[PDB]
């Protein structure tokens with residue numbers, strides 16, 4: 117037996133079907149992640165990603181910041197929370213500008229078919245081309261994704277701060 | 288087809304009848320070795336050199352132990368320990384003998400390899416018949432057989448004397464009685 | 465001395481490096497070490513690569529073990 | 540079979556070997572391992588077809604029987620006296636003579652001599668594996684000549700193997716009992 | 725008790741009680757899943773039993789080397805995290821089970837690459853199964869011995885309580 121084969125029977129792609137790229141564990145694990153989980157609107161994907169990211173982002177800032185405390189301090193928790201929230205704001209700014217400069221679409225998975233059927237004799241790159249058919253690959257989709265990331269980041273950072281305070285106080 | 292010495296063994300292929308003392312006693316088939324410059328010619332030359340060396344050594348031990356040492360030489364009757372007494376007082380004799388034996392052995396090895404290469408010299412042959420005791424044939428074969436048998440017996444004897452002198456630190460006939 | 469009696473040279477005894485390498489295949493490695501014997505017996509540069517890499521690593525190991533366990537008197 | 544009738548036969552105990560009755564409950568005469576490879580680890584010779592485990596076992600059984608017969612003779616001899624006409628062999632039984640003589644440098648000499656003979660006759664065994672007509676245990680040793688008359692040879696064969704089995708068991712008992720018929724525990 | 729992998733020399737198709745002679749393919753897939761999960765968990769449990777007995781670096785020593793005693797000494801908030809991790813792993817395994825071409829114990833998805841399996845692949849799967857079975861028996865024996873005697877594996881062996 118051989119556990120490495122050309123990806124999708126194409127020996128010319130710059131890719132391989134290894135026990136890591138195309139394993140059933142990899143398939144299921146990546147399909148349960150918010151970025152690829154089926155049945156999620158882009159706002160929901162952004163909200164979940166932001167929640168998880170703020171939740172694990174408050175950690176390093178609170179623990180190793182400039183205002184640490186070997187005991188529990190409200191000032192240390194506030195400093196870590198503010199740093200995490202501002203980092204989420206910076207990431208949201210990056211997401212917003214990236215989406216602004218990347219896509220020009222409001223409804224995908226159709227425009228591609230329209231220009232593959234009804235011809236696309238225009239300036240292209242909006243009618244024709246169009247990389248990716250996901251709802252995240254639109255101006256509207258990425259805007260809602262960034263909004264969800266930002267709101268979920270705030271909520272997750274607050275939740276993680278509350279959990280840290282409870283763990284440090286009642287344990 | 289069966290070896291004369293060992294009837295339960297097939298005749299060793301390389302030992303037909305030619306060499307003196309041949310009775311087919313090669314249970315391990317060492318005569319068939321043809322590697323590391325070792326073959327039947329080299330093995331026979333080594334056997335003959337061992338035979339001659341053992342004969343000389345056994346004769347020397349017996350002579351010195353029975354008739355005593357030559358004048359001016361140490362005594363003690365232990366031939367394995369009297370060597371260090373000779374070296375302690377006449378090291379130059381031992382060194383000169385060693386150098387002579389070394390040169391003669393280099394010549395012997397060169398002769399063995401040459402005679403093995405361009406086959407003209409029988410193994411163990413050094414053209415040393417100053418008194419002409421083996422000129423004619425039909426006596427040369429008998430003399431070869433006598434030399435081989437005496438040399439094997441003296442090989443065994445000399446090894447025994449060496450081990451006895453090293454272990455018991457006494458003379459050969461001293462161990463005998 | 466024991467390790468020197470491993471590879472088959474002139475008798476029916478020992479190993480053939482070709483047979484050892486060719487038997488070490490696997491699911492993840494395809495043909496495995498097939499052809500490595502031909503590579504290392506027809507290319508001086510491959511032998512030099514292996515020998516020089518292991519030789520430099522050995523030199524560094526020697527350097528470590530030297531001061532770590534001084535092997536000479538008054539060194 | 541002719542013994543243990545509820546087992547048919549091992550597989551190879553046809554009857555071509557002397558003293559054959561068919562007794563082999565464990566089927567040990569069917570191991571595919573050529574035990575000559577315990578001597579010559581490699582095939583070595585291209586003509587080495589191989590030796591059946593049954594023939595190797597027959598050679599081992601004959602050798603064991605001869606060893607045990609000589610051993611019981613010696614052990615019985617040293618129980619009733621019979622010391623060698625030389626010093627340093629006084630009386631020290633058989634349960635202690637072995638160690639005291641291993642100490643006195645002559646059991647090593649016996650080991651060397653027995654090993655020399657064993658190596659020669661094992662070369663015979665290896666030639667048999669190579670495909671010589673020599674049968675197991677046949678060293679062609681008939682100096683006195685009571686081995687002619689093929690019927691007498693076959694009778695003496697079966698006699699030797701049966702006596703060897705008896706002597707193996709008797710030596711096991713004698714060494715285990717530390718002798719009871721001629722000495723005490 | 726089929727052409728399934730796991731039949732070894734000592735007892736080929738070992739179903740003395742006929743559990744598989746009447747079951748359909750789905751029940752047999754369930755049985756294989758249970759056997760493989762038990763075997764893997766038991767291999768981990770045996771290795772942990774021994775290693776914990778002669779090495780417990782975590783928790784600043786303490787956490788008495790005898791298992792079934794350290795079970796009641798872990799902070800019980802580390803128990804929760806191990807439980808949640810196992811739960812997430814088995815949720816992922818459940819998600820894997822609905823992938824097309826799924827095989828009972830195959831969570832690596834080897835069916836993607838292994839079509840027309842060899843004898844080496846079957847032999848390795850049988851090796852895993854047999855090691856898992858031996859580890860199941862071993863861990864059952866470990867737990868029972870520690871319960872009845874009170875000493876751990878290398879402690880009972882060292883004293884000689886056999």
Ligand code: CLA
Nearest residue numbers: 609610612613616617621622623628636640645646649652
């Ligand atoms: C298995 C066989 C065997 C063995 C191992 C022994 C061993 C021993 N016997 Mg012994 N013995 C035996 C059979 C045996 N015996 C038989 C059959 C007899 C009756 C004939 C005797 C009669 C006997 C006497 C009368 C005495 C001993 C003594 C001894 C002890 C001293 C000898 C020694 O130190 O080792 C020496 C080395 C060996 C014994 C190894 C044997 C090597 C032989 C000699 C090689 C040749 C074998 C021969 C040619 C076989 C022919 C077959 C084939 C070639 C055709 C020793 C424990 C002495 C003692 O003090 O015991 C307490 C003693 O006084 N034995």
Ligand code: CLA
Nearest residue numbers: 768769771772775776779780781782787788794795798813
């Ligand atoms: C069923 C498996 C199992 C379970 C329940 C436990 C349980 C326990 N172990 Mg433990 N252990 C195991 C296997 C297991 N072990 C194995 C296989 C090893 C060998 C590496 C160890 C080595 C080990 C040490 C060295 C120590 C413990 C300790 C402990 C105790 C505290 C928890 C801890 O720190 O774990 C620590 C566990 C590890 C460091 C190794 C766990 C590695 C896991 C089992 C493999 C990967 C699991 C993965 C997430 C899921 C599989 C993926 C896929 C197959 C689905 C606790 C009673 C500590 C203690 O107090 O001892 C008394 C301690 O110091 N264990």
Ligand SMILES: C/C(C=C=C1C(C)(C)C[C@H](O)C[C@@]1(C)O)=C/C=C/C(C)=C/C=C/C=C(C)/C=C/C=C(/C=C/[C@@]12O[C@]1(C)C[C@@H](O)CC2(C)C)CO
Nearest residue numbers: 366367368370371392393395396397398399400401449453
């Ligand atoms: C390459 C080579 C030669 C060659 C070649 C050539 C040149 C290329 C030509 C051809 O083309 C090929 C070839 C291969 O032939 C090899 C050379 C040979 C060697 C390596 C020489 C070894 C000799 C050693 C001996 C012979 C020593 C013996 C020791 C004794 C000790 C005696 C004692 O008294 C002492 C001292 C103390 C006492 O208490 C007791 C004892 C222990 C008995 C007995 O005597």
Ligand SMILES: CC(/C=C/C=C(C)/C=C/[C@@]12O[C@]1(C)C[C@@H](O)CC2(C)C)=C\C=C\C=C(C)\C=C\C=C(C)\C=C\[C@@]12O[C@]1(C)C[C@@H](O)CC2(C)C
Nearest residue numbers: 374375376377378379380381382383384385386387388390
């Ligand atoms: C090598 C030699 C002696 C070597 C001795 C050594 C190494 C001993 C060294 C030691 O003892 C010391 C020193 C001190 C100890 O603490 C250490 C040792 C090591 C123990 C003598 C050679 C001695 C060499 C001699 C005697 C040579 C004689 C040559 C003659 C007669 C030649 C004649 C011819 O040349 C003509 C005349 C005409 C030609 O055409 C024909 C011929 C026939 C060839």
Ligand SMILES: CC(/C=C/C=C(C)/C=C/[C@@]12O[C@]1(C)C[C@@H](O)CC2(C)C)=C\C=C\C=C(C)\C=C\C=C(C)\C=C\[C@@]12O[C@]1(C)C[C@@H](O)CC2(C)C
Nearest residue numbers: 562633634635636637638639707708710711712713714715
């Ligand atoms: C068990 C045994 C044989 C058992 C045989 C059995 C069961 C046979 C059963 C059958 O036949 C029957 C009954 C009926 C058949 O129809 C069926 C079978 C089945 C065929 C032999 C042991 C044999 C055991 C032996 C031979 C042990 C020997 C030990 C020796 C010699 C020790 C020597 C020493 O050297 C040391 C080690 C130390 C020195 O200090 C001291 C000494 C004493 C000198």
